[PDB]
Ligand binder design. Structure first.
Ligand SMILES: Nc1nc2[nH]cc(Cc3ccc(C(=O)Nc4cc(Cl)ccc4C(=O)O)cc3)c2c(=O)[nH]1
Ligand SMILES: Nc1nc2[nH]cc(Cc3ccc(C(=O)Nc4cc(Cl)ccc4C(=O)O)cc3)c2c(=O)[nH]1
Ligand SMILES: O=c1ccn([C@H]2C[C@H](O)[C@@H](COP(=O)(O)O)O2)c(=O)[nH]1
Ligand SMILES: O=c1ccn([C@H]2C[C@H](O)[C@@H](COP(=O)(O)O)O2)c(=O)[nH]1
Lengths: 285, 285
């Protein structure tokens, strides 16, 4: 299972093409990739390097709340969005009227209030827009065979207002044999930094909706568009490529939860996670 | 190249799971698939069965025009959308106020006028919404390294107004070594009927934008969500699996075109297309 990610790293270091990007450092890029990660009695948290599990859990809770405020996530101890919500970074894109911390209409706003007119991060959008997340959960409950269970974060109208366009832009759910599966289309994948984070994120989301809809987790299909390795990540990934993968851990929910909003960080417990030491990989801004 | 499609049919007949659907007849379904079709000096028009090439060309031109009128495509001789735009089918979905032929906000409306308020099929939306198709062509001209060249047809706001939700919902373009590539995320794939039609469709779209932006066609990556084989398609597909695949044909554009709207059906010529006889496969409504 984890051999698919490491096999994607091998294929990009060997067959990747040089390609400049938005940031400064170039990449080795490959277009069009797909890997399948089983969720049956295991959770896909990479073992060749310690993955920031506390950030995955808190960011998803921050996603489910519908918040677009990096400070509310930073208050929990997760600074991954502080960079993209700084006065320096915000002023660069022409959002000088915008208060610090407002990422604009991003994943949390599109998941719960798709189509509503975005005011600011402190507004109240309850009853406005399309609540895709709850609509997904309802369809799985009443019509699991439906082929239209999609949560889309790519809004061409709200694109000029986002600090960073959605990278995991579209996901689709699927039910058969009382197993819930999820396929994610990621338009842009930082194979060293974001991709392991995104894999655990949507795997955790599948466990949540499976717990709500009374199903067993099945497969997570990760579909990549531009899969790229930043130049300053080549050396750290070559080290991680030498480490022997260890068996995946397991995720256990500790209390029966009925609504998706009532999930708390204390409800989850990762058991048997024995990863290799963390490898530093700098973020390209 | 064509062995990937036939291999997907082979995999679904062996490992597919029974699954009921919107229509009457069940399916054999598989969730999560990806195939890569090269566009270099060949066009992926299936040879184990004659593919409706005249419908592919006219429907795409009908898509580029932005039309949501099934009658306007039927006037050219393509009846594939007449079924979904009949008074019987339209009245069923609660669109009794809607005039016959109006498919609602569909691919043509989302490609050229994303986010505008949909009135009727005869309206004029010039200047309204986001012109995703032209923005895609402009970005490829000025910033080919951009990782956000996406044309999205899935609009959660306009979903309750569509006669049929988008099956090919999102596509992304990619440029390297002066080669243009396209990846399509198809949420639902009729492996017997629509999938061969969709493969040639977006392959033709890549040839068009490659001609406009002065690039060479690269790869078409077809990504499937629910890839399903209808029960009444099992026998025709088992016949097609017995035929030996023949080399792909070639597409030649006959005049230099500068705008995407100025493409005419007479500008294209398929050379060397020697397919096996057409196999009838009934559409599930
Ligand atoms: N090039 C580029 N830009 C990005 N912007 C936004 C993202 C998304 C993104 C960003 C960070 C992480 C992540 O685990 N971080 C950290 C992990 C540890 Cl263990 C310690 C510190 C950080 C940190 O640095 O806070 C996961 C996803 C992202 C990305 O992945 N690549
Ligand atoms: N179950 C289901 N419903 C659908 N609605 C919309 C589509 C999409 C769709 C529909 C039709 C075709 C197609 O090549 N047609 C034909 C081919 C020949 Cl050779 C002759 C006649 C027709 C015809 O049909 O006139 C391709 C895609 C579609 C689908 O593929 N499956
Ligand atoms: O969840 C996320 C968010 C971001 N990124 C990376 C992909 C890109 O390297 C960068 C965003 O750059 P653009 O492709 O939007 O230019 O962030 C991820 O991999 N996963
Ligand atoms: O371009 C298209 C259009 C339609 N379909 C098929 C997929 C499904 O079998 C059906 C659409 O119905 P739903 O999946 O929304 O139920 O049409 C395709 O394969 N390709």
């Amino acid at each position: 299972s984890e051999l698919q990610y490491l096999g994607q790293i091998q294929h990009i270091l060997r067959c990747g093409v040089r390609k400049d990007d938005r940031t400064g450092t170039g990449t080795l890029s490959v277009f069009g990739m797909q890997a399948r990660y089983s969720l049956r009695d295991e959770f896909p948290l990479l073992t060749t390097k310690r993955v920031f599990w506390k950030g995955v859990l808190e960011e998803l809770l921050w996603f489910i709340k519908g918040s677009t405020n990096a400070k509310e996530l930073s208050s929990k101890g997760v600074k991954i969005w502080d960079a993209n919500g700084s006065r320096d970074f915000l002023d660069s894109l022409g959002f000088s009227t915008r208060e610090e911390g407002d990422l604009g209409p991003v994943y949390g706003f599109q998941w719960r209030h798709f189509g509503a007119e975005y005011r600011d991060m402190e507004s109240d959008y309850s009853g406005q827009g399309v609540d895709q997340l709850q609509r997904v959960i309802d369809t799985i409950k009443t019509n699991p065979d439906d082929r239209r269970i999609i949560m889309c974060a790519w809004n061409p109208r709200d694109l000029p207002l986002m600090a960073l366009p959605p990278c995991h832009a579209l996901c689709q759910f699927y039910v058969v044999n009382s197993e819930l599966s999820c396929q994610l289309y990621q338009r842009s994948g930082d194979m060293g930094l974001g991709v392991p984070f995104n894999i655990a994120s949507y795997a955790l989301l599948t466990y949540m909706i499976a717990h709500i809809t009374g199903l067993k987790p099945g497969d997570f299909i990760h579909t990549l568009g531009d899969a790229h390795i930043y130049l300053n990540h080549i050396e750290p990934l070559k080290i991680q490529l030498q480490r022997e993968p260890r068996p995946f851990p397991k995720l256990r929910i500790l209390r029966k939860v009925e609504k998706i909003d009532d999930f708390k960080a204390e409800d989850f417990q990762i058991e048997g996670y024995n990863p290799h030491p963390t490898i530093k990989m700098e973020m390209a801004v």
